[PDB]
Design a protein around this ligand. Structure first.
Ligand SMILES: Nc1ncnc2c1ncn2[C@@H]1O[C@H](COP(=O)(O)OP(=O)(O)CP(=O)(O)O)[C@@H](O)[C@H]1O
Ligand SMILES: Nc1ncnc2c1ncn2[C@@H]1O[C@H](CO)[C@@H](O)[C@H]1O
Ligand SMILES: [Cl-]
Ligand SMILES: [Mg+2]
Length: 331
């Protein structure tokens, strides 16, 4: 069918810049972390101009769906909903989605600005500091099911919980009642795991595929029981548990990707797939690596490939993205 994957997310503009460690210190940021800007960090946005930053579209789920749309090519192959502000920045994101052929229904929040994320590159790592702005007012429209009619893969990032957990809950609810449809979720960042524990619990029950990195699962283990790689991964599959797709995919930088699935009979299958080596000197920045991996994974899943094949496609998409500035598109 036309629409193959439908997602909700926070559309944001990324401002990328290479900054010295001193900048991280002055802004109270932890290298490699992802957080929402506190009042004191608001000054980071204007101050970046001294570093000649570059700007490009961002937003975790948007980045992912853009990979699926690029690989599927047909207009409306991927659908997306989110909220943008009534400003020139919002217009740039919108124009870009239209030119890429994605199907979108953006909600415009008058009086508010389009979200922005400062992507600070230092050493090799990326640190993210975001100001949601209009993204926080996002509410799914009553007829979203009509816009996404035909889609069998629904995706949401935990980052959408900040606006309200109702959005993702409604999407999962809908998918659940549809046979042959699956709901997929990304843990997004440690902060989401720690702040939205309750909503996540209800959400996990209705999740078919859970994606996240080692750091996110670690917090998920602690916040929940299991505690403890492989064990953490097998651990998380209970949260989704208690043939219906139940799979957990854990990414971890250059280390092998670990996927654990629970088959119909209760058999647990775990795959440990290596990630092709990429010389460090060839890496530009790792911003968007996980989003690219999820996008390649969902596109392959859309084509009926196997779990291992899914993972290989995700790895290939991520390897391309890490060789570019911010979230690029190529292949
Ligand atoms: N050093 C590296 N060498 C090769 N591949 C790497 C890599 N770092 C990341 N990847 C690729 O990226 C995938 C995801 O890595 P990871 O989840 O750790 O990214 P992330 O958490 O940086 C990205 P974002 O900026 O979206 O938040 C891995 O499964 C792998 O395919
Ligand atoms: N709170 C957030 N919600 C959604 N996307 C985000 C958030 N913070 C950072 N991102 C995005 O994560 C991407 C890297 O995975 C960047 O392109 C950035 O725009
Ligand atoms: Cl998002
Ligand atoms: Mg990384």
């Amino acid at each position: 069918g036309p629409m193959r994957v439908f997602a909700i997310g926070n559309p944001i503009l990324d401002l990328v810049a290479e900054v010295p460690s001193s900048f991280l210190d002055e802004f109270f940021l932890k290298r490699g972390d992802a957080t929402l800007a506190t009042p004191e960090q608001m000054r980071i946005y204007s101050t970046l101009d001294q570093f000649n930053p570059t700007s490009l579209p961002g937003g975790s789920a948007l980045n992912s769906v853009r990979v699926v749309q690029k690989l599927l090519r047909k207009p409306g192959s991927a659908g997306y909903m989110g909220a943008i502000g009534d400003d020139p920045r919002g217009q740039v994101l919108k124009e870009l989605c239209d030119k890429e052929g994605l199907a979108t229904r953006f909600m415009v929040a008058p009086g508010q600005s389009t979200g922005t994320c400062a992507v600070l590159i230092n050493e090799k790592e990326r640190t993210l500091c975001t100001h949601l702005g209009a993204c926080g007012s996002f509410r799914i429209p009553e007829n979203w099911t009509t816009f996404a009619s035909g889609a069998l893969i629904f995706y949401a990032t935990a980052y959408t919980l900040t606006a309200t957990p109702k959005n993702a809950l409604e999407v999962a609810g809908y998918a659940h009642g549809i046979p042959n449809a699956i709901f997929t979720l990304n843990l997004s960042a440690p902060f989401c795991v720690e702040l939205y524990k309750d909503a996540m619990q209800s959400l996990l029950l209705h999740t078919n595929i859970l994606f996240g990195n080692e750091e996110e699962f670690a917090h998920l283990a602690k916040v929940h029981n299991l505690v403890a790689k492989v064990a953490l991964s097998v651990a998380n599959k209970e949260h989704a548990v208690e043939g219906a797709t139940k799979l957990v995919v854990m990414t971890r930088g250059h280390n092998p990707v670990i996927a654990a699935e629970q088959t119909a009979d209760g058999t647990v299958v775990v795959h440990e797939v290596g990630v092709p080596v990429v010389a460090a000197e060839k890496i530009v920045d790792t911003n968007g690596a996980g989003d690219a991996f999820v996008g390649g994974f969902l596109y392959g899943l859309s084509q009926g490939k196997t779990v291992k094949q899914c993972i290989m496609c995700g790895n290939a998409c991520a390897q391309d993205v890490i060789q570019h500035v911010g979230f690029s598109l190529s292949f």
